Amino acid sequence: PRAPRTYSKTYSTPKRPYESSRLDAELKLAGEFGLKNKKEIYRISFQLSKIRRAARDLLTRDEKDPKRLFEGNALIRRLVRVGVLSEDKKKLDYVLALKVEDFLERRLQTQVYKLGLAKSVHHARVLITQRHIAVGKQIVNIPSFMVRLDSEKHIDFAPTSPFGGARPGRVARRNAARKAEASGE
Amino acid sequence: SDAVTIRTRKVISNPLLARKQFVVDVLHPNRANVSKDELREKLAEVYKAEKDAVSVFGFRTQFGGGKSVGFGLVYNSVAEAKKFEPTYRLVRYGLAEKVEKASRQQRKQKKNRDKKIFGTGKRLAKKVARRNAD
Amino acid sequence: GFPMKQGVLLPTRIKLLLTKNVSCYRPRRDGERKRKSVRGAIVGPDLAVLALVIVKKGEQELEGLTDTTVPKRLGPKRANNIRKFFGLSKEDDVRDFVIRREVTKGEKTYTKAPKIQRLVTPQRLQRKRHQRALKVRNAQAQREAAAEYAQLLAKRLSERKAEKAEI
Amino acid sequence: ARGPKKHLKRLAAPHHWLLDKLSGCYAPRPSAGPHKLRESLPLIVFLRNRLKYALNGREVKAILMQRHVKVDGKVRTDTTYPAGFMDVITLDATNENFRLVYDVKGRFAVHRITDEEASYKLGKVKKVQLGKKGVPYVVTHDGRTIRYPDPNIKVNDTVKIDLASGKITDFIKFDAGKLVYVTGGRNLGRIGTIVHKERHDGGFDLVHIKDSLDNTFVTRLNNVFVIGEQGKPYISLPKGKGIKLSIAEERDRRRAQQGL
RNA sequence: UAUCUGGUUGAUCCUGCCAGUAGUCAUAUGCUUGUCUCAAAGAUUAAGCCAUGCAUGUCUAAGUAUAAGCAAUUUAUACAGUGAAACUGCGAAUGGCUCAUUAAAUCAGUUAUCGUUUAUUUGAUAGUUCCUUUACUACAUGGUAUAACUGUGGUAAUUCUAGA
RNA sequence: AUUCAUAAUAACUUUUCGAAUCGCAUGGCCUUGUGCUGGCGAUGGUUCAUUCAAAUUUCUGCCCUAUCAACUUUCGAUGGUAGGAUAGUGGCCUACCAUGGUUUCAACGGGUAACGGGGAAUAAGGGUUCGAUUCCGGAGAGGGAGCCUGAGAAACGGCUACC
Ligand SMILES: [Mg+2]
Ligand SMILES: [Mg+2]
Ligand SMILES: [Mg+2]
Ligand SMILES: [Mg+2]
Ligand SMILES: [Mg+2]
Ligand SMILES: [Mg+2]
Ligand SMILES: [Mg+2]
Ligand SMILES: [Mg+2]
Ligand SMILES: [Mg+2]
Ligand SMILES: [Mg+2]
Ligand SMILES: [Mg+2]
Ligand SMILES: [Mg+2]
Ligand SMILES: [Mg+2]
Ligand SMILES: [Mg+2]
Ligand SMILES: [Mg+2]
Ligand SMILES: [Mg+2]
Ligand SMILES: [Mg+2]
Ligand SMILES: [Mg+2]
Ligand SMILES: [Mg+2]
Ligand SMILES: [Mg+2]
Ligand SMILES: [Mg+2]
Ligand SMILES: [Mg+2]
């Protein structure tokens, strides 16, 4: 006896398991964005499915419907806040047209790579997982973080990272110790 | 030195429990989990009462390090601290002693054994001794 | 070991539903009854011990029955019980006659005595006068509240009769 | 079954207490008292969850046992005491006075009053009847039995109770145009004036109420509580005054006063 | 997230199912298993059977203290502190478990009690107590009868109890 | 809406209640008697309200089955009168009386690997399947029945009996 904790699945798997077109398009997304799974693509497609469904029944409602206005503005605000939907094209007809590439563009792994700072998406991910990037003053080690368009200018190297300062790194320290051992004092 | 810069937010005076209560957020860069003792002393000077009458608890440190957030209580004197603080926190501060009591199972078993005796039972012991002796 | 029960005019053992306020049974819950086996009242070879009470003394003094006397464990506790125990009067001071027992702990011989129950005290009389005065003053407050309501009804009646009779 | 229930499972408590889903299997079960269970606010919920003076029930009991809190001028050491609508809560320490009035979201609000306001409450007349010895009396919404009421007082009227002496100071009838407060249903917390009252003999009289901005709503008479004349309430209303903003305009003022 | 593909023929188009396909807070099982958070879990078959231990007791300034209890106590030679036991009072009808019964039955929403009971809470409430008053009974306060306890026991054994 | 609230009269009763209780402080007064008054609480108690309820109760709604078409009515089925019983209504029971009551708009019976609901899974829409199980209601404590104490149990970490 206690209130159940709520949980949800964040992905769906596709309908036909083996479509060469979908398999190629998914692998191209994984390669271009440095993803680990097809589940990473599936999770985005699942998020589009919920967003597109919500926008869909809102558009079924006529204009100036209080619910269509209120919820449609909140959905537009959130997607504009996260950068998936442009600052213009602020409409439900335009949130209906959003793609998986729009969401993958806003991952921290992509943004760490595109703001210099990583020289690769795979480099960006390992730097992220290894606690080298702080989105603000907060270290973020999740590559799917959804930078929200106000944090872009705050993304930088973690202050407690050897790429940020205050420590030259564990392996560099051991190697410098060996050199001191061989050389002297 | 390393800029501990303790500060207290959401300060509320609670005359009902003769204390002040607040959140304690602690900036400790290049440091980890400063302490409860030195937080208590520093809160003792900033609120100028005593170390004894200052209680701190909570203090989860932020992911990535360099900051911890907890809760603080400053009482208006030691005696009301000992009146309202929980026993476990007073034992944490050395202000009390962890009372010597038996295990929970041992107490329950002793209670269920003493349910079988009616009265003081020394009459039962006397009769049992005499019956076995003679 | 089954005890005899008075009123069972039988020499054998019988089960009975025993209740509150009967022998051979101590109830454990409220209104709880148990069936128990009780030896009958008729004495016979089936027994193991008889309890007997000496109603008339004999010609010889028994070694441990009658030669001895057991000190009374407790003295009186109620005021009039002390009065009839020491035979003083209906009206007297019973505090002087309270049995005080002396307890020694090596050096300190301290005396303890019962608390007299139903003792007439100024606290008791003050409580009596308070309850009486509360009853009288509540009755007066009721009477004055009724009177105030009555004059209010009379004024309202005068208002309504004049308004309806003239308009 | 077999007798009265003593526990209140969390998720079965009144929603307006705003208790968290997790951190507990149970909720404070209000004691028997002046207000109904679902319509009450236990003292532990008020002292701990709303006023934050206590971190847990043990501190709530510690506060109450020193006789700081008082509901309608009496100490009420009970932890689950069922304080309700228009109850006056006094804390002699902090010199604070509260009246339990719902905000416009149908929840008891932390509403502060002065000492002069805390000197009295209002009661809705639940019944008028002759008692023994033919003595008339009224029964209010908080269970108060008040002897010798004014004869003009009927059911659904409101009385002003001295709260030092259990005495009526004055009263308000139930008529169109009088300010009322919604104490139940889905319009709970709204304030407006009676437009008219439709009878429905045999069941459920209804009341038509419009607020300041001419928004009308219909509520059962059981939920309607008279609180004053046109304007000028006899109680100090909470912030909002029962206007019931829409969510769009609610959001508009959120973004207005959050951006200075 | 309004999608179908394989299989009857020499080939064809149909009917038509078989097969595949995707989910399942949907169970089991196989292989495998590094991290964090969350956390279901003897329902189904057997409301089958259970060793053992625990799960219901509770005392405030404020019912009863002569423990032959400890501290010794605030005039404190009636008591006064703490206080086992045992009376007294309250609780044990809540909780927790399970789903066997049960098909207008349970139950859901909605009614009624002008057809009833209701400890507790809260509010209010009690000058009248005189057999037949021209037969008033301590009210500065009625009475005995019991527990714990003393002591003597019975039974292999029980949360058994007896006699004084 | 009442034979309601309440009040009145004549009586009635194995006569109910109407403080023989407890803590703290111990103020005021005059025929200074250890006299008269006196506070803040505790616990009790009648009755009425209230709160918590409880019991009963109105309408509509439940899966498969006709290889279940008639069912209930002897030992109440359906209604009436009176009584008894109950906390109270009521065939709840009893006496007398009447012959009713349901049903192809599926009665009655049989099955359920049926507790009911809030809900869950899947799903374009409509639907289909599930819900022993965190909340609500109900039932039970091996199976039956019966009862004590209690405001409240037909109680099972209460009792009695049978199996
Ligand atoms: Mg239960
Ligand atoms: Mg097929
Ligand atoms: Mg780790
Ligand atoms: Mg089982
Ligand atoms: Mg289970
Ligand atoms: Mg248990
Ligand atoms: Mg009980
Ligand atoms: Mg459990
Ligand atoms: Mg279980
Ligand atoms: Mg009770
Ligand atoms: Mg008491
Ligand atoms: Mg009849
Ligand atoms: Mg009848
Ligand atoms: Mg079943
Ligand atoms: Mg179900
Ligand atoms: Mg179910
Ligand atoms: Mg089952
Ligand atoms: Mg049961
Ligand atoms: Mg079993
Ligand atoms: Mg039973
Ligand atoms: Mg059991
Ligand atoms: Mg039980």
Side-chain angles (χ1 to χ4, degrees), chain C residues 136-157:
Chain C
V136 165
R137 81 181 72 193
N138 295 9
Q140 287 167 346
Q142 286 300 323
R143 263 198 313 266
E144 60 87 24
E148 196 191 11
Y149 188 75
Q151 60 70 27
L152 206 76
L153 282 198
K155 194 259 292 179
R156 295 295 171 86
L157 182 83

PDB file of all heavy atoms in Angstrom, chain C residues 136-157:
ATOM      1  N   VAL C 136     -26.456  27.234  40.427  1.00  0.00           N
ATOM      2  CA  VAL C 136     -27.327  28.370  40.720  1.00  0.00           C
ATOM      3  C   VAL C 136     -27.102  29.497  39.717  1.00  0.00           C
ATOM      4  O   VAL C 136     -28.059  30.131  39.254  1.00  0.00           O
ATOM      5  CB  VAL C 136     -27.114  28.843  42.169  1.00  0.00           C
ATOM      6  CG1 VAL C 136     -27.708  30.226  42.375  1.00  0.00           C
ATOM      7  CG2 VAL C 136     -27.726  27.851  43.146  1.00  0.00           C
ATOM      8  N   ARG C 137     -25.845  29.767  39.361  1.00  0.00           N
ATOM      9  CA  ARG C 137     -25.569  30.882  38.461  1.00  0.00           C
ATOM     10  C   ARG C 137     -25.938  30.561  37.020  1.00  0.00           C
ATOM     11  O   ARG C 137     -26.320  31.465  36.270  1.00  0.00           O
ATOM     12  CB  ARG C 137     -24.100  31.304  38.559  1.00  0.00           C
ATOM     13  CG  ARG C 137     -23.126  30.466  37.759  1.00  0.00           C
ATOM     14  CD  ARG C 137     -21.709  30.968  37.960  1.00  0.00           C
ATOM     15  NE  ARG C 137     -21.208  30.647  39.289  1.00  0.00           N
ATOM     16  CZ  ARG C 137     -20.115  31.171  39.825  1.00  0.00           C
ATOM     17  NH1 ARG C 137     -19.379  32.055  39.172  1.00  0.00           N
ATOM     18  NH2 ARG C 137     -19.753  30.802  41.051  1.00  0.00           N
ATOM     19  N   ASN C 138     -25.816  29.297  36.609  1.00  0.00           N
ATOM     20  CA  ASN C 138     -26.299  28.909  35.289  1.00  0.00           C
ATOM     21  C   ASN C 138     -27.813  29.047  35.204  1.00  0.00           C
ATOM     22  O   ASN C 138     -28.345  29.484  34.176  1.00  0.00           O
ATOM     23  CB  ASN C 138     -25.867  27.481  34.966  1.00  0.00           C
ATOM     24  CG  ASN C 138     -24.363  27.342  34.850  1.00  0.00           C
ATOM     25  OD1 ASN C 138     -23.617  28.268  35.171  1.00  0.00           O
ATOM     26  ND2 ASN C 138     -23.907  26.178  34.401  1.00  0.00           N
ATOM     27  N   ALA C 139     -28.524  28.669  36.271  1.00  0.00           N
ATOM     28  CA  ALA C 139     -29.977  28.808  36.285  1.00  0.00           C
ATOM     29  C   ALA C 139     -30.395  30.272  36.230  1.00  0.00           C
ATOM     30  O   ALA C 139     -31.376  30.619  35.562  1.00  0.00           O
ATOM     31  CB  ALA C 139     -30.557  28.127  37.524  1.00  0.00           C
ATOM     32  N   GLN C 140     -29.684  31.143  36.950  1.00  0.00           N
ATOM     33  CA  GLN C 140     -29.974  32.572  36.875  1.00  0.00           C
ATOM     34  C   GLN C 140     -29.661  33.129  35.491  1.00  0.00           C
ATOM     35  O   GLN C 140     -30.425  33.940  34.955  1.00  0.00           O
ATOM     36  CB  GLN C 140     -29.192  33.328  37.947  1.00  0.00           C
ATOM     37  CG  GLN C 140     -29.720  33.132  39.357  1.00  0.00           C
ATOM     38  CD  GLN C 140     -28.753  33.622  40.416  1.00  0.00           C
ATOM     39  OE1 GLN C 140     -27.581  33.869  40.136  1.00  0.00           O
ATOM     40  NE2 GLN C 140     -29.244  33.768  41.640  1.00  0.00           N
ATOM     41  N   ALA C 141     -28.539  32.708  34.901  1.00  0.00           N
ATOM     42  CA  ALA C 141     -28.198  33.149  33.553  1.00  0.00           C
ATOM     43  C   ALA C 141     -29.231  32.674  32.538  1.00  0.00           C
ATOM     44  O   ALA C 141     -29.551  33.390  31.584  1.00  0.00           O
ATOM     45  CB  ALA C 141     -26.800  32.658  33.176  1.00  0.00           C
ATOM     46  N   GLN C 142     -29.743  31.455  32.713  1.00  0.00           N
ATOM     47  CA  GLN C 142     -30.825  30.983  31.856  1.00  0.00           C
ATOM     48  C   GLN C 142     -32.072  31.848  32.008  1.00  0.00           C
ATOM     49  O   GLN C 142     -32.724  32.190  31.014  1.00  0.00           O
ATOM     50  CB  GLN C 142     -31.146  29.524  32.173  1.00  0.00           C
ATOM     51  CG  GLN C 142     -30.109  28.542  31.671  1.00  0.00           C
ATOM     52  CD  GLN C 142     -29.938  28.599  30.171  1.00  0.00           C
ATOM     53  OE1 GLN C 142     -30.902  28.794  29.432  1.00  0.00           O
ATOM     54  NE2 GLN C 142     -28.707  28.424  29.710  1.00  0.00           N
ATOM     55  N   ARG C 143     -32.428  32.195  33.247  1.00  0.00           N
ATOM     56  CA  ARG C 143     -33.632  32.987  33.484  1.00  0.00           C
ATOM     57  C   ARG C 143     -33.520  34.378  32.871  1.00  0.00           C
ATOM     58  O   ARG C 143     -34.494  34.896  32.313  1.00  0.00           O
ATOM     59  CB  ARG C 143     -33.909  33.084  34.984  1.00  0.00           C
ATOM     60  CG  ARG C 143     -34.922  32.075  35.497  1.00  0.00           C
ATOM     61  CD  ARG C 143     -35.478  32.492  36.841  1.00  0.00           C
ATOM     62  NE  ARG C 143     -34.429  32.911  37.764  1.00  0.00           N
ATOM     63  CZ  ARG C 143     -33.849  32.114  38.650  1.00  0.00           C
ATOM     64  NH1 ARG C 143     -34.162  30.832  38.739  1.00  0.00           N
ATOM     65  NH2 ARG C 143     -32.929  32.615  39.469  1.00  0.00           N
ATOM     66  N   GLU C 144     -32.347  35.008  32.980  1.00  0.00           N
ATOM     67  CA  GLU C 144     -32.184  36.348  32.426  1.00  0.00           C
ATOM     68  C   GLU C 144     -32.103  36.327  30.905  1.00  0.00           C
ATOM     69  O   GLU C 144     -32.493  37.304  30.255  1.00  0.00           O
ATOM     70  CB  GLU C 144     -30.950  37.027  33.024  1.00  0.00           C
ATOM     71  CG  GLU C 144     -29.635  36.307  32.778  1.00  0.00           C
ATOM     72  CD  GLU C 144     -28.980  36.699  31.467  1.00  0.00           C
ATOM     73  OE1 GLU C 144     -29.257  37.811  30.971  1.00  0.00           O
ATOM     74  OE2 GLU C 144     -28.188  35.893  30.931  1.00  0.00           O
ATOM     75  N   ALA C 145     -31.568  35.251  30.321  1.00  0.00           N
ATOM     76  CA  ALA C 145     -31.571  35.133  28.866  1.00  0.00           C
ATOM     77  C   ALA C 145     -32.984  34.940  28.338  1.00  0.00           C
ATOM     78  O   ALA C 145     -33.342  35.489  27.290  1.00  0.00           O
ATOM     79  CB  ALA C 145     -30.670  33.979  28.428  1.00  0.00           C
ATOM     80  N   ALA C 146     -33.793  34.142  29.039  1.00  0.00           N
ATOM     81  CA  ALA C 146     -35.189  33.966  28.655  1.00  0.00           C
ATOM     82  C   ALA C 146     -35.958  35.276  28.765  1.00  0.00           C
ATOM     83  O   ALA C 146     -36.765  35.608  27.889  1.00  0.00           O
ATOM     84  CB  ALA C 146     -35.840  32.890  29.520  1.00  0.00           C
ATOM     85  N   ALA C 147     -35.719  36.032  29.840  1.00  0.00           N
ATOM     86  CA  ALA C 147     -36.389  37.317  30.010  1.00  0.00           C
ATOM     87  C   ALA C 147     -36.007  38.293  28.904  1.00  0.00           C
ATOM     88  O   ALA C 147     -36.869  38.998  28.369  1.00  0.00           O
ATOM     89  CB  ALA C 147     -36.055  37.901  31.382  1.00  0.00           C
ATOM     90  N   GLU C 148     -34.720  38.350  28.548  1.00  0.00           N
ATOM     91  CA  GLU C 148     -34.295  39.229  27.464  1.00  0.00           C
ATOM     92  C   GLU C 148     -34.939  38.823  26.145  1.00  0.00           C
ATOM     93  O   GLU C 148     -35.304  39.680  25.333  1.00  0.00           O
ATOM     94  CB  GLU C 148     -32.773  39.223  27.333  1.00  0.00           C
ATOM     95  CG  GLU C 148     -32.239  40.382  26.504  1.00  0.00           C
ATOM     96  CD  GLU C 148     -30.773  40.234  26.160  1.00  0.00           C
ATOM     97  OE1 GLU C 148     -30.219  39.135  26.375  1.00  0.00           O
ATOM     98  OE2 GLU C 148     -30.172  41.215  25.675  1.00  0.00           O
ATOM     99  N   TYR C 149     -35.034  37.518  25.888  1.00  0.00           N
ATOM    100  CA  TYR C 149     -35.710  37.056  24.681  1.00  0.00           C
ATOM    101  C   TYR C 149     -37.194  37.386  24.730  1.00  0.00           C
ATOM    102  O   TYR C 149     -37.798  37.708  23.699  1.00  0.00           O
ATOM    103  CB  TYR C 149     -35.500  35.555  24.494  1.00  0.00           C
ATOM    104  CG  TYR C 149     -35.995  35.033  23.164  1.00  0.00           C
ATOM    105  CD1 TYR C 149     -35.285  35.272  21.998  1.00  0.00           C
ATOM    106  CD2 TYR C 149     -37.169  34.296  23.076  1.00  0.00           C
ATOM    107  CE1 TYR C 149     -35.729  34.799  20.783  1.00  0.00           C
ATOM    108  CE2 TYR C 149     -37.619  33.816  21.866  1.00  0.00           C
ATOM    109  CZ  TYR C 149     -36.896  34.071  20.722  1.00  0.00           C
ATOM    110  OH  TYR C 149     -37.339  33.594  19.510  1.00  0.00           O
ATOM    111  N   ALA C 150     -37.800  37.302  25.916  1.00  0.00           N
ATOM    112  CA  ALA C 150     -39.233  37.557  26.040  1.00  0.00           C
ATOM    113  C   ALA C 150     -39.565  39.003  25.697  1.00  0.00           C
ATOM    114  O   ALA C 150     -40.517  39.272  24.955  1.00  0.00           O
ATOM    115  CB  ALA C 150     -39.704  37.213  27.454  1.00  0.00           C
ATOM    116  N   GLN C 151     -38.787  39.953  26.224  1.00  0.00           N
ATOM    117  CA  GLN C 151     -39.032  41.357  25.913  1.00  0.00           C
ATOM    118  C   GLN C 151     -38.745  41.656  24.450  1.00  0.00           C
ATOM    119  O   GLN C 151     -39.333  42.583  23.882  1.00  0.00           O
ATOM    120  CB  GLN C 151     -38.216  42.261  26.854  1.00  0.00           C
ATOM    121  CG  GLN C 151     -36.681  42.121  26.837  1.00  0.00           C
ATOM    122  CD  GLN C 151     -36.017  42.622  25.560  1.00  0.00           C
ATOM    123  OE1 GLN C 151     -36.543  43.501  24.878  1.00  0.00           O
ATOM    124  NE2 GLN C 151     -34.860  42.058  25.234  1.00  0.00           N
ATOM    125  N   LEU C 152     -37.818  40.914  23.837  1.00  0.00           N
ATOM    126  CA  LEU C 152     -37.594  41.055  22.404  1.00  0.00           C
ATOM    127  C   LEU C 152     -38.808  40.590  21.612  1.00  0.00           C
ATOM    128  O   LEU C 152     -39.210  41.242  20.641  1.00  0.00           O
ATOM    129  CB  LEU C 152     -36.347  40.280  21.983  1.00  0.00           C
ATOM    130  CG  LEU C 152     -35.663  40.818  20.724  1.00  0.00           C
ATOM    131  CD1 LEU C 152     -34.892  42.088  21.049  1.00  0.00           C
ATOM    132  CD2 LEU C 152     -34.750  39.775  20.104  1.00  0.00           C
ATOM    133  N   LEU C 153     -39.403  39.461  22.006  1.00  0.00           N
ATOM    134  CA  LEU C 153     -40.599  38.977  21.323  1.00  0.00           C
ATOM    135  C   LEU C 153     -41.761  39.942  21.504  1.00  0.00           C
ATOM    136  O   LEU C 153     -42.530  40.184  20.566  1.00  0.00           O
ATOM    137  CB  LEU C 153     -40.977  37.589  21.839  1.00  0.00           C
ATOM    138  CG  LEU C 153     -40.168  36.396  21.326  1.00  0.00           C
ATOM    139  CD1 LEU C 153     -40.919  35.102  21.571  1.00  0.00           C
ATOM    140  CD2 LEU C 153     -39.850  36.552  19.855  1.00  0.00           C
ATOM    141  N   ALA C 154     -41.904  40.503  22.707  1.00  0.00           N
ATOM    142  CA  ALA C 154     -42.971  41.465  22.961  1.00  0.00           C
ATOM    143  C   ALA C 154     -42.815  42.710  22.097  1.00  0.00           C
ATOM    144  O   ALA C 154     -43.800  43.232  21.564  1.00  0.00           O
ATOM    145  CB  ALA C 154     -42.996  41.837  24.443  1.00  0.00           C
ATOM    146  N   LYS C 155     -41.584  43.213  21.964  1.00  0.00           N
ATOM    147  CA  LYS C 155     -41.348  44.364  21.098  1.00  0.00           C
ATOM    148  C   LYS C 155     -41.637  44.026  19.640  1.00  0.00           C
ATOM    149  O   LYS C 155     -42.242  44.826  18.920  1.00  0.00           O
ATOM    150  CB  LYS C 155     -39.912  44.858  21.267  1.00  0.00           C
ATOM    151  CG  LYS C 155     -39.654  46.237  20.681  1.00  0.00           C
ATOM    152  CD  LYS C 155     -38.969  46.152  19.326  1.00  0.00           C
ATOM    153  CE  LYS C 155     -37.551  45.625  19.460  1.00  0.00           C
ATOM    154  NZ  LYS C 155     -36.876  45.518  18.137  1.00  0.00           N
ATOM    155  N   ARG C 156     -41.197  42.850  19.182  1.00  0.00           N
ATOM    156  CA  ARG C 156     -41.468  42.451  17.805  1.00  0.00           C
ATOM    157  C   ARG C 156     -42.965  42.302  17.565  1.00  0.00           C
ATOM    158  O   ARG C 156     -43.473  42.690  16.508  1.00  0.00           O
ATOM    159  CB  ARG C 156     -40.744  41.146  17.468  1.00  0.00           C
ATOM    160  CG  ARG C 156     -39.227  41.227  17.476  1.00  0.00           C
ATOM    161  CD  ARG C 156     -38.694  42.146  16.394  1.00  0.00           C
ATOM    162  NE  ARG C 156     -37.263  42.379  16.551  1.00  0.00           N
ATOM    163  CZ  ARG C 156     -36.319  41.588  16.060  1.00  0.00           C
ATOM    164  NH1 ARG C 156     -36.618  40.518  15.341  1.00  0.00           N
ATOM    165  NH2 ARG C 156     -35.042  41.882  16.290  1.00  0.00           N
ATOM    166  N   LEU C 157     -43.684  41.739  18.538  1.00  0.00           N
ATOM    167  CA  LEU C 157     -45.130  41.598  18.402  1.00  0.00           C
ATOM    168  C   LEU C 157     -45.808  42.958  18.299  1.00  0.00           C
ATOM    169  O   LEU C 157     -46.732  43.140  17.498  1.00  0.00           O
ATOM    170  CB  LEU C 157     -45.685  40.804  19.584  1.00  0.00           C
ATOM    171  CG  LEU C 157     -47.185  40.510  19.573  1.00  0.00           C
ATOM    172  CD1 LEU C 157     -47.483  39.283  18.733  1.00  0.00           C
ATOM    173  CD2 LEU C 157     -47.694  40.329  20.989  1.00  0.00           C
TER     174      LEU C 157
END
